[PDB]
Every structure is written in C-alpha cells, then in structure tokens.
Amino acid sequence: EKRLFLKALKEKFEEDPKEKYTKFYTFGGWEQSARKREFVEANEKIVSEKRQGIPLYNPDIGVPLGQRKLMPYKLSNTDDYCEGDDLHFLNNAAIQQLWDDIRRTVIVGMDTAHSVLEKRLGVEVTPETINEYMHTINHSLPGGAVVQEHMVEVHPSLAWDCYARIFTGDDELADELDSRFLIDINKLFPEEQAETLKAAIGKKTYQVSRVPSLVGRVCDGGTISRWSAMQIGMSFITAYKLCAGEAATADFSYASKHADVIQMGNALPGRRARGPNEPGGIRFGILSDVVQTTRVSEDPVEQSLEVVATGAALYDQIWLGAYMSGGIGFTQYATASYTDDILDDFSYYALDYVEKKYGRMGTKATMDVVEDVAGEVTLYALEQYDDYPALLEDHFGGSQRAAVAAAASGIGVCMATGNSNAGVNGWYLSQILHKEYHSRLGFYGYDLQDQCGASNSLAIRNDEAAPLELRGPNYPNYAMNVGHQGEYAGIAQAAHSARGDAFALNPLVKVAFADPMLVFDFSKPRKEIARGALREFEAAGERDVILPAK
Amino acid sequence: WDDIRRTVIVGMDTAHSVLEKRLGVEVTPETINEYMHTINHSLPGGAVVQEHMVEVHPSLAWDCYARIFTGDDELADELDSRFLIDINKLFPEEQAETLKA
Amino acid sequence: AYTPQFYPGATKVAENRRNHLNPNYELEKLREIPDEDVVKIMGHRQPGEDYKTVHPPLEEMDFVEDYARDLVEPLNGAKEGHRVRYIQFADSMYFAPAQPYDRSRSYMSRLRGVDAGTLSGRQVVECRESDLEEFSKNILMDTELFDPATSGMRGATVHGHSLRLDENGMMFDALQRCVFDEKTGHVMYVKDQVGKPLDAPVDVGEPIPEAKLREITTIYRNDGVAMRADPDVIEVVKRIHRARTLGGYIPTNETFKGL
Amino acid sequence: VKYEDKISLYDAKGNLVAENVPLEAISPLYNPTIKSMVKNIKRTVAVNLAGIEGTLAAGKIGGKGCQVPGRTLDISAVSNAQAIADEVEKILKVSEDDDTAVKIINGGKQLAVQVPTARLEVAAEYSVSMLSTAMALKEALIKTFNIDMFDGSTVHAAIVGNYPQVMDYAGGNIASLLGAPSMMEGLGYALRNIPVNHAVATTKKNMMNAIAFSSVMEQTATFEMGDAVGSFERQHLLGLAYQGLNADNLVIDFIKANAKGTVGSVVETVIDRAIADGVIVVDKTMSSGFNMYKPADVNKWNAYAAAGLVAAVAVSCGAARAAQNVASVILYFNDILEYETGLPGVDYGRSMGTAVGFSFFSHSIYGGGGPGIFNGNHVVTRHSKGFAIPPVCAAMCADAGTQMFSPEHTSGLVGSVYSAFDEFREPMKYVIEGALSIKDQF
Amino acid sequence: VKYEDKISLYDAKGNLVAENVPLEAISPLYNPTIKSMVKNIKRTVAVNLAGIEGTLAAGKIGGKGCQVPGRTLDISAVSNAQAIADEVEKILKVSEDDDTAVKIINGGKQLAVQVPTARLEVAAEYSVSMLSTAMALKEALIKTFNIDMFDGSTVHAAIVGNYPQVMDYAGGNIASLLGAPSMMEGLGYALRNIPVNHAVATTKKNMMNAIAFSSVMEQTATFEMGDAVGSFERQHLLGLAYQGLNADNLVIDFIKANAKGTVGSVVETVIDRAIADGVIVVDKTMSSGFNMYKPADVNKWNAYAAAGLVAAVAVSCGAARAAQNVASVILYFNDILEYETGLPGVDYGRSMGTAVGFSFFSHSIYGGGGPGIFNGNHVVTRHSKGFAIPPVCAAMCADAGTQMFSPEHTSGLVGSVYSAFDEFREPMKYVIEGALSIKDQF
Ligand code: F43
C-alpha cells in the first residue's frame, strides 16, 4: 500500500516501517544528537564565562536521555528535516515571529474619522490628504516625532519591521491611493475571492498598524492597541492641521481610534487574567482568517491543515506551552499535527471517503452523516497506527494519536456538511471511539472536553453554546487542555474550505494578513517553521544596535 | 523591568511538610542541595524525566537562576554557597539581624 | 434482581474485557511471587519495618456522629491510619493482557476504596499501604493481568507502551528496571518501580507466550482482532454519543425519540 | 430618629410641596421609590428583535466586522413579535401572579421584558435577568420557527454574542442598564453604570428630572459601596437632597438669581446664601482684609456647594446652549469658591479632580467621546462620590444639539424602554411623593 | 403546578418525613428555606478580631510575608469585643428591628455580623455587606481606641488587605462565603464561588448536610445563570431533589446496599432500582446479547444516576477514608454505567469530563491541588451544572486527615463563623421543613 506518511518513516527509521521489533540502549545516550552536543558545549562555555561556576545544564542528572533513537522530524509538504529541539518555540525564531506578527496587528477603520473631518472639523479629505496621513503615520508609528527634533525618538533600525498599511473595498479610492503602503485586494487575491471580500467589506477604508515587534517584546499584548491609537491620533492631528485642545478633537479622537478598532484577541477574565491581543483571546475563525492558504491553494485539505499547523504552534506551543504552564512545554504535543504527512494522509482519506459517499457538500448536517464519517475515519486512522509500528513509535504519546485521528474525522465531517459544530461533534465521537478501540486516550487531562463536548457541541445554553468559529481558548471546556485548540481552528477552516469561502469569520483580518510587508508570511506556515528550525529565518525585535559587541 | 518581571519567590516550607508528613520522606540539607542542583537544571528548561524530550538552548537561558535563602543560620551553614543568597554576607549586621528577625 | 452484562460485543477481546469487569470471574493464576518480593519491588518500604502513619487510628481520634458515613465499613489500612501509596503499571500496545482503561474499570469494579487513574503510557492505583500491598500481590502481580514482558511496574520515566518490543519480546525501559536472563528464560527485576537498585534481583517468572497473549488481551488491533469485527461495541459507542448530544441539546423525551 | 435635619421639598417648577420633611425620608434605605427604581433596573431587559433578524439574515454574528458565511437563518422575528413575546413570558413565568412583563416596543422591532422578582430573590447578582431572558428568547426562537438542531449555536451567537469566549455581550442584541459585575471599576460600582445620555433620554431631556435620576443612582451607589456608612451618611443624604431633589429650592433659587450671571456670580450667591442661613461663619480676618470663613455645619456647607455647582453648570450651559462647558465650570467653580472663601469645595477637591478628568477626557486628542457618556464606573470619573456626575445631566439637557454624542444618537432604545415607567421618566416627582408617604414614621 | 411528578422526603438518617411532595416544593423559586439561605449568605460577614489584633500589633499589613516597620498599633480588640460589636451594630443599624446581628464567637476572637436586609434591597450585588462591615469596623476601632488620624490607613489595611490596589480581600481579616465578583469566571457564577472546604467546615463535616448545602447552592446558581429555565428546569429540580436531598431515600438506600461494596456494585444497584421503578426500559437486544437501554424518563434517569454517583463517592471514600478518590469514582461510575447500559452519564458526560480534568489537576504539576480548594467557579469544576461538587463535599466530609489543605487549614474563620447559624449548618432539616410549608400550595 502507498501512504503519504511512508517516506518520513523510511527516512526517520532504519528498520522497516512494518517491522515489529528493534533494539535500544546502544545509541550512546544524548551524544547521538548534534543539538544536545551543541547544548553541552554552549552550557560549559556559558557557565564558565557568564555564570562564574553556577551549574546551568546538567544532562547527567535526571533521566538518562537517548536510551532510544532520537528521531528527526520532517515538516509536512516540505522536503526538509530537523531535530525536535529546533521545533521548540524558544529555539525557533519563526514561531516567535508568527506570534509577534499576530500580536502587533491592529486594524482601525477610517470612515467615521473622515466623516468627522469633512463635516464637523470642516477639513476636506482627498486621496492626496490620505497619502499625506499615511506618510505621517508611517514616520510616526515606529518611534517617530513629526517635525519635532527636540522630542525623544526610537532608533529607526530598532523598528525596521514597523509599517502602516491601508486597504479599502472602494476601487477608485484604491487606484487613486499610493501603492507604497496599500494592501491591494485585487492583485493579492483571486478574482472571485477579491469580489467576495470587497462585497463583505463594502466601500469602507481601513488602516493596518504593525506596531514594532520590540514593543511587544518589552511590554504585553494590550500595549499594541494603545500604541496604535496614540500614534494614529498624533498623525491625524499632524497631517491634518487641527487644534488639539477642543471638544471637536475629542469627538474626532473617538471617531479615529475608538470607533472601528478591530483587535486580534479579547481580554480574558478571572484566573486567566490577560489583556487584549493575547493568544487566549483569539477565536478559531480569526486564526483561520490569519492563515492565507485560500489565496494560493484550492485544496480544502491543505487549507485546513495550514490552519491546523498555525493553531498548534500558537495554542499548544506558545499559549498553553508557556503562557498557561511554562517549562519545557508542549512542543511535540503540537508538532505531531504538522511534522509528517500522517494528518495529511488521514485528512486526504477523509476527503476521499466523503467525496465517494456524500459528494463534496451534498448532505445537510444530520446525526447519521456525522456518525458514519467520523467512525470510518477513526477506524482507518487507528488501523494505520496498528499495521505500522514506526507510525506508533513516531506518535508515542496517546494524546500526540487521539487529536490527529479526531482532527481528520472532524475535517471529513466539515467537508461533508459544511457545519463547524457538526465537525466538532465528529471530533468528540472520534475521541470516544478511539478510547474504546485502544482502551486508551491521551494524558491523564486529557478528555474533559471530549466526553463533555458531545453534549456541548450542539448545546443552546448560555455558557455552553457557541459556533466553533466564535470559540477559542477562553471557551470554558477548552481552557486548560493541550492538543485540541489548534485542531479546532482547522475544523473551523474545513467548514468554509468545503464551501470555497474567501474568509471564515472576519474579512478585515483576512485582507490585513495578506500584506507582503509582514516578516512572517502566513501563506506557508509549515515552510517558515522549517526555515526557523534551520536558523535561516530573520526575525524582528532584536536590540542589536543598542548593545555592546563584546 | 525584565529582572523584576522574571522574579518569583516561593516559600519552600509547606513543600517540605508535604514531603515529611504526607509522603514520609525526610528532608535534610543534603536533599535540599540535591534539589537545588536539580532545579538549576530544570528551571532553564532541562529534562529530568520523560525520555525523548527536547530542551531549550542554554545560550538563551544563561540569566536563569534558582536561588535559596533562609532565615535559619543553622540551615544556611551546611547549604551549598553556589545556590545560596547569604543575608549575613550581603547586608550590614543590624540590617541582617532585622531581616532575619 | 438485575444481572449485569458489563461490556457489549461478541468478539474475544470483548469477552476478555467482560471477564476483567466481572468481579465474580476468577482471574487465572500464572505466577507465585511472595509478599516480601512485591513489597521490595514497589520500593515504598523494606520488608520488616512497621507501617508508617499519615493520621492517627480512627479509634484513637474522635469524630462527629455521622450516620451516613459510619455505616460504610473502612479498609484495614484506613482504621490503622496508614499512608496512601501507589502502584503504577505500563502496558504495551502489542497484545498486553491488561490495558489502562480496562485495568481502571476492573480495579474500580473489584477493589474497595482505591483511586485509579489512566493514561496512555501508565495506569496508577492509590490506596492505603497495607491494603495496596495485599491486593497488588493477590491480583495485580500473579494473575493474567500481568505479563513480565509486555507490562512493567514503573513509578517514573514511563516510556515504551507504544514502542516496538526488543529481540527478547520485552518492553522498552529507559531506566532498565527489568532484565531478561537467557540461561534461565525468566525475567528479573533489578530496580524498584522508582528506579532505585535493589540489594538482590527478584524473579517474577517467565514471559507469557505470544500465542497465549493473543487470546487474553483486551486491546483491538488490525493484526489481532479489530473493531470492524465487533460492530456492536461501535454501535453502543455511537448510541452513547448520540444520547449525549441530544441530552445536551434539549433534555426532553421528545428529543430522545430520535435516538 | 438620629438626624434632626429637616428639609422642604419643591417640585421641578420651584413650587413648595411640603415642609419639615425629615432627611431620612429621601434616604435610599427608606424611600420606596428609590427601592422600586433599583429593583426595576435590576430586572428590566431590552431586546432588539430587529437586530436579531438583521444579524441572522446576513450572518453577522460575532463582533465588529465579523461575518460567518453559511450560517444564515431567514426568520421573521419582527413580523411574529407577539408570539415570541408570549413564549418568552410563558418561559420566564414563575407564579401566575408574577411580575413577568414582556411588552412590544416600536411595532414588534423591540421587546421590553421584565423578569420576575422571584428569580432575583434567589440570585446573588443582577445578571440573572439578562441570562434568563437570553435563554427564554433562544427557546422561543427555536420553537417558534423550527430551527434545526445544528443552528442553535447561530441563534445563540445572534442573541448574546461571543459570551463563552468574551465575558460580555458585545455583538448581541440584548442590553441592560448595568454592565457585567466582573467589569466594574471597583466593588459596589454596579449602580454607577448609567451614562449621562441614558438619564437624559429617560427623562425626556428634562433638566431637574435628569439631575434627580443621576443623583439618586450615584448616592444609592455610594450607599452600596459602603461609603455612606457612619459619619459619611449625613453628608451623602444632604448631598442627594440638595443636589438632586432641590431641597429648600436652592438650585432653582440660584439659577433665578443668576439668569444673566456668570459662574462667579453663582459663587457669590452661594456664599451669600450660606452666610444668611448660618451654614458658614467668619473664622478670622487677616492683615490684608480677607475674613476667612469656616463651616458651622460641614455637611450642610458641602450640600450648599453641590447645589450651587449644579446651578453654575446650568447657568453657564444655558448661556452657551452647549454641553461642552461642564468640566471648566465644575473645576473653576470649585477653584473660585476655595480662593474666595478659604472654604473647601464640593467633595473636598474630589469634584475638582473629576472635573480635571472630564477636561482631559472631552477636550483633547488624548480624550475620547463627549460628556454624554460620563458614568461613575469609569476610571476617569469614579473619584467624586456622586457630586460631579448630576451636573453633567443639566449640561446635556441644556445642549442645543451641538454634540456628536447626543442622547438621540446613543440612548434612543434606552429612552423608549425606560421612559414608560413613571418613576424613571419623572424621578423627582415620584421620589418626593415616596418621601411624603413615609414622613410620619420618623 | 406545571410538574406532576411527586417525591417523598427523607432526613439524613433515612427516616420518612412526608410523601407525595410536589417537585416544585424544593425549587429555589418557591422554597422559603432556599430563599432565606440566599438572603442570609449575602449579608453574613466573618470577622477575625484576633487576626486584626495580631496584624496591627506586628504590622503584618500587605499580605504574604509583608511587614511595614513603623505602622504598628497596639490595640486590645479581643478584650473590647463587646464594645466593638455594639458600635458595629449601632453603625450598621437601619431601623431598630432590622435583622442586624453581631454575635460574638470564641470569646471575642471572632465576630459574625449580619448587615440588614434593607441595606441589600437597594444594592445591585452582595459586596455591600463586606464593604459596610469594613467601614463600620474601621469607625468602631477608630473611636474605641483613640487612634491617630495618620494611622487610620493602617487600620484600613489591617481590616482589608490591599483593596484599592488588588480588587479582592486577601491580606485582610474579613471574609465571606462568597468570593469577590472580580474572581467570577462567568456571569451568574457568584453562588458557584464557594469552595468545597468552606461548605464542609460550615456543615461541621456532616456528609449529608454538606451534600445538601453544595447541591442547594449549585442548583440555585444554575437558576441564577439561566441554565435551569424552560425545558431545562425539570432536570435541575430532579437533580436537586434526588442528589442533595435524597427524595426517595435513594442515596441512603444505595449506600446501605453497598456498605461493603465497590463502585461497580453501586452501579448495578442503580441500574436495578431504575429498572424496578420503570425509569429505564430495554431499547433493543443486540446480536451479542447486549441489552441496550433507553430512558422512559430522561430527567428522572439523570436524577437517579446523580444520586447513585453521590452514593458511590460516599461508599468508596468511606471505605478508603481518604478524600483523594472523588475524581476517579466520578469518572468510572459514569464510565462503567455508560458501557453497561448504553445510557448517557450523570450530566450527559459533562460530569465525567469534569472528573477527567479533576483527575488531571488533582494528580499533576499543572495546577489545581487538593479536592477541597475546588468550587463551581473553578475552571476545572465549572462544567457540570450542579452534579459534581456535592460528591466532592461528601468525600471531604469522609476524609480522616490525609489532606494537607484540610478545611481546618483553609476554612477556620469562615467555618466557625458560619456554623453558628442553624440554617447553614444543617440545611437538610430546614429545606425539608420549607418544602413541607408549601407542600399544599401546588
Ligand atoms: C511527570 C509528568 C507529570 C506532569 O505533570 N507532567 C509529566 C512531566 C512533564 C514535563 C517533563 C519534564 C522533563 O522533561 O523531565 C513537561 C515538559 C511539563 C513541564 N513544562 O515541565 C511535560 N510533561 Ni508529560 N509530556 C509529554 C508527553 C507525555 C506522555 C508520554 C507518553 C508515554 O510515552 O507514556 C505522558 C502522559 C501519559 O500518562 O501517557 C506524560 C506524562 C508526564 N508528564 C508525567 C509522568 C512522566 C513519566 O514518564 O514518569 N507526558 C507526550 O505524550 C508527548 C509530549 C510531551 C510533552 C513535551 C513535548 O511536547 O515535547 C511533555 C510535557
């Protein structure tokens, strides 16, 4: 038989993938991996120079590592391999920039501001004036002070990643504006997607403020909205020469920086207390709109799986990995959704089975379609683990198999029906069928939301009901446990990828993250994590110009 | 701001009581020194259990330290000075006595 | 009265699961390990010292008069105030006779006053120390629930439940608490479940053969028997899922007409 | 009794109603009218059926700029309306003699539901009203139009909006006068959530009634905060009586005396009235003249200064016919009074600090919004304990339509819902009547 | 009226009280005892006078390991507790017959105050009790011992820890059964913020009384959250009646039938009783011979499973006499019930998942802790709407002292203060009496 995950198993395992036996305890320990050896030399040098004898890294104490073969990791749809330590979010600059670009993004609309300028302030708003304002905000957003040399300013090379962009559904305003700082919908999207997004947005103008990454490094996520609002107000009162001491300026300030602000994430309450633009506040549909695979691909499985990879690397690796727990983290809890083509093979089988039986989107979402599609995909995914011992050895944790199989089942249900809640219902059925198949499920966590979910997937109660696009890490069932949130966003994307939709939840987020000026390009999230694993990703937020070289 | 943000003080006295009366494990300064040696490896992100685990680069965690200080002079005597914050050495005598009290 | 049926399914694996769930089913005896050997393998205490105490005995301490609490008899370790200890097993996915959810369910349906917890790589039981030693030696070690090759008692660093067996048919163990001697064919324990080495190796016995392991396992496998050969368990699972969904939506009798 | 203070009650036209009324007759702990307004605010829910229909038709669930393709439901909530209201009333009904009241507003496009007090008697917080109304509305919509089981989440998102993810009602079509109790500035700040524009629209742009509404809510909130407990209760009762309810006709008298005047003339009339009534006396005369003044009654002097503050705001904003002057009038009223008498201002400088807050909030690019959205549950405006907000109601009532944050733009639904109740449309008259009903028990 | 199913009533000893009691007689919207419990839980404040004296004597204001040298006050509050209580009662009194009670507990070491109901009628929430008690205590301490004006800040810090900076009461010596509204994880979760240790210490470690207290609080909360309205109300009413009040003596009979049994024996007892009562019937017989069951009454089967869940928890944790078994018992009762019958769990698997997360956060490094610190407001135990917390309360009642964070360690002031009231200590014998009082009104 031919399987998509077979090639990675041939490369990662010396033995035959179907062979049931191997040997251990003859790999030399941690010396089998070049990353561990590099860590050891770096630790000795760092201790002796900086730490003045205080021990930092001691591989001798603790578990004797390397008793089994430390396998390398492929990255799905990419022809490159890396060690598992390179996929850790602290060791991978691409994952850090993935979160940095999302954190530093604020979308503000300029239509109430223009209306207040035209009517209440008596100032004409022309495309030339909009170009002047865009020049002013592009100078002023990173650290700049317009025509005030006495003012203290941030070093420009320290904020090279900062940009202020504009986009609009109004076409004649778009061609009348400067292309230097314009996100052109027509040339960045296909014709049907551009028409759909222009219809959804309307005839309104929006500005995208990319606050510099270092601001998010030093401060928190709620800093970004205040930074963008302050600089937008300053650039508006500078480019348009307005008095900054009257009540009309207060009304214009509301219209310009408090009327149509679109934030990436909401604030979180209680014991998970956090500000806006933190990854616990990002809904699954918003993250689906962040990833831009519908722009460059027509395959619904690939469109869902790029969102799966981005959601894994954000929610499981960064948010739950450090923000909620900390430590070594949950890196290969999440990489198993995007290392090999295991999830790719399972999702392509789900798509093939749905296309053979129910067509592309030929059935209304009922119970029976959910049951039979999720059961078939779960049985196939589990027997694939059964007849490939190398596949079982790769996904050694039962959580890093439950999620994969349930994500494939939910993706298949979302193909068949187009409803995201039906897809999450298929996910929950797949989880309990996995539990009865292997007499096993994840970690010891791991199915608070998977035995509960069944009842809360189609609930209508206040704290139990939400569409899956409106759900996120602050959803009460999904608040704590790893291995679900990233795959939920792919299921939410799979509902709209089956319909061929241009966006999932927010058209403005979809257009904003199509910007070529972003350092992390969200068109191929798997490929750039590979680039950050091979140390060829140029990240932002480095204070190299304010630090000594010795 | 980074040094203030990354600082967390945890009292290791209820944990010793849990070790002593719930698990029946005696706590000696030798075991405390072993714990300090362990946590100075684990706090930057080293692996102590769970074979086939990745670790962070120690070059990115050179500023990560786990330190211990005690108001007990007898415990602070046979404690490893590598991990110990010495109140008597870092403070004037009256200030040291006030802090220990 | 009501006669229990424990699990659905007509396949051999479902029959083994029903046998494990049934408290009136006598588990097949395969080994004979003395109590001192099991105590020294758990590593909680040496054989010879008294049981240490987490709280005074129930006779010495005084309580309020609670009618509902005092008509349930306690364990012998509970009235002696013994500490709560653990025994933790890792079960291979290649036809181990006991499986984590199966074990948990069997231990909760058979033993009194135990805390059972399941994971992918480990299953742990918490109970009072004397009772824990008693049921561990009587049931968990010398029955069909244990195989020295495919099941190892590991208190920490559990890894190997989903890995391939070695050339001796034994599970992977990073700490190597379990060794196989070829000149006798038995399996020896050189460390306790935590990983501390013992004074002398303790023999647990010969590994169960693979042909016997196929007919006593409680896991579904494509190379063994699969869930596709047991549609009744899948139907029960789908019914449970549909009942959960309908109860979550609207908990009325009219909603459950579409069951 | 414990307070010997007597007040004379006047109506909004300056005519005498009753004399020698005890000060505790207008207390929130005694007045039945204030209790009724608190209970009605706690149990009244406003439902936008037209907003629900528009959200479901276009699939506009979520928040600002959010739209889910494929999750569109074509129901007719405005056309049915009465059936939905009957179903919601039947679900929310506890007893047959219940206070459950689901009335139809603007011909079916809005609902004004009042949940029974039985559900609030066993609730620790007021949020039972909105959650119960949301659940009843979801059930009524699912049963009235046969919504599929897989679209109940869409119905919930249209009604409430992002609640399990965002602990608030952001993109929904259900509203209340009180925000989430976890979104308060401080503990006990729930009653200071009604903005100025809501109070103005509820009272149909009446000056004295909006002042009375704002003062009643603010001082009842100070009672809720524990601030008006012990030695502060007399000062808060006097502040409520003289600032919001026009005790001894002080506000009307100062406005009549300063019809052509300025803020300084209002300060002069306030000092003259306080000297004539014996509230303040001469402390000592300095070498350069300037006889210092000290209060013979500290709380009464604070109440007189608060009434004069309201009158000064009314005089200046009736001269300008613009509501942008509130911050400067409060700030420099307090400043001129302090450096004219050597006496403390309203709330001992807290009113001046809140006026500085109003200044930087409504007069700069650092500012945001106008004075119509001022409420005590904001970090800018929380500092004065019910002495700086009721003048803003007079200022917005005197506004001749030169504010972007007009009451018509921001509080039309609130006015249409809460103007039907008599104690909300005319709080002054009914609070005076409730004080008259309990005169003899003191 | 709208529910025609009747229940019997049994006490904690298993003796019959009355028969044919309507289901709505124990409803939170009808039962006078539940209404009185909710009203009294909102006005009762626990005061640590000895804690205040120790904090002031050593300058321990601030919180965990915080000392301010120089702000040390030497007062004798425990000796002058009678005068302090008299002054607090004088300050907090509204009329002269108001239900204001300041009782002295443990010889002046603790103080149990009850602020009047009229102070809470005009309050939107429950925070008025603690703030009013703090202000009354501050005034009483300032005027009893002649404390300087520059040390009233220290007195405030001793009474309430860091309230203007931290929106909570952490370093102070005042407490209540309910948590702060800022700690709520959802709207309507105010009654869910009672930890298990507080309920166990309130009922003096009586198993059935703690089950009744936790069940009454949790189901009244589900009424407050709007969850138990409409078609959802009958399920929560039956869950409160059977799991929490042992309506048909199901809990006591199951525990008696499994005195020397396991969780599985309780499961078969529950299935046998449900079959004998006609609650469940055989749906179909499969080819393997498995008898798939269907509920003839869905909500009654839910209530029977919940009562059996409480019985299984009591049996296993009375056998072990250790409270660390709740999560496993709640998990595997449902886990083997579902695959024995083909029927859904206690809360359609919302409670088994609660146990799967309880098993995470009671046996791992990632958070949680002992079973006693969890509550309905906790992120781990909020998912089951009143069906998982009374088992935890029963298990903590059955604990013999194997927990480090015991109710004695955690709830010493709260338990001693709230055990002085008969309604909080023994909720069974008074909720049954309240049901008997309104038995004839349906
Ligand atoms: C000590 C714990 C208790 C706990 O709270 N976390 C542990 C350990 C912890 C540590 C590992 C510390 C180290 O490197 O030594 C961390 C990294 C959490 C942290 N931030 O400190 C972690 N686990 Ni765990 N943990 C994992 C996993 C697992 C799987 C292992 C499967 C199996 O082979 O048995 C099992 C759960 C199970 O019950 O099945 C597991 C258990 C356990 N995990 C058990 C017992 C471990 C034991 O072997 O003795 N982890 C995995 O399934 C893979 C992902 C992996 C996480 C790190 C990563 O993503 O690289 C890691 C995540």
Ligand SMILES: C[C@@H](OP(=O)(O)O)[C@H](NC(=O)CCCCCCS)C(=O)O
């Ligand atoms: C339970 C709760 O912990 P506390 O009981 O509040 O200490 C909560 N845990 C979490 O959500 C941990 C999330 C990530 C750790 C486990 C990942 S599977 C938290 O951190 O606030």
Ligand SMILES: O=S(=O)(O)CCS
């Ligand atoms: O073993 S646990 O499920 O507790 C944590 C695994 S990361």
